[PDB]
């Protein structure tokens, strides 16, 4: 299914952004410090989120919560099982044609689970 090199790149990004907690600030500051504007803008358009300028209605977020267990995600982040977390949210993304930067996408999905779950 998922290419393991992309899984590990996503897991490493999650580990770096969220080493000190899954927070909106840690996500946005990590993304703005590590990705080009163009890459960020593509994710913002795909997910209808604002990253480069808590819980409000979002299409994709609701479909994410209907398919993927919030409890499974939060447990993975609690244990710092970042590659477990990555495969779980990447399975949702590839299914739904979320083809923008997988590290940013995974970061946003993990944030949604923790801050909105």
Numbering used by the authors: 58 to 110, 126 to 189
How do the authors describe this structure?
In previous work, we described the inhibition of Candida albicans virulence following exposure to the 68 amino acid bacteriocin, EntV, secreted by Enterococcus faecalis. The processed, active form of EntV is 68 amino acids and is both necessary and sufficient to inhibit C. albicans biofilm formation in vitro and pathogenesis in both a nematode (Caenorhabditis elegans) infection model and a mouse model of oropharyngeal candidiasis (OPC). Notably, EntV appears to have no fungicidal or fungistatic action, but works to inhibit adhesion and hyphal morphogenesis, both of which are required for virulence in this species. The protein is further cleaved in half by the extracellular protease GelE, generating the active form of EntV which comprises the 68 amino acid C-terminus.
Unprocessed EntV136 was recombinantly purified from an E. coli strain as a selenomethionine-derivatized protein and crystallized. The structure was determined using single anomalous dispersion (SAD) phasing to 1.8 Å resolution, allowing for high resolution analysis of the structure. All residues were visible in the electron density except for the first two amino acids, the last two (169–170) and an internal region corresponding to residues 90–104; this latter region notably corresponds to the GelE cleavage site, and we postulate that there is natural flexibility in this region. The predicted disulfide bond between C106 and C167 was not observed in the structure due to the necessity of producing the protein under reducing conditions in the E. coli cytosol. However, the two cysteine residues are co-localized within 3.4 Å, consistent with the ability to form an intramolecular disulfide bond. Interestingly, the structure resembled two “clasping palms” comprised of three α-helices each. The first three helices are in the N-terminus of EntV whereas the second three are part of the C-terminus. The two palms enclose a final C-terminal helix, α7. The NTD (N-terminal domain) external face is negatively charged, while the CTD (C-terminal domain) external face is positively charged. The positive charge of the external face of the CTD is due to the presence of many lysine and arginine residues, while in contrast, the interior face that interacts with α7 is hydrophobic/neutral. α7 itself is strongly hydrophobic, as 11 of its 16 residues are hydrophobic sidechains.
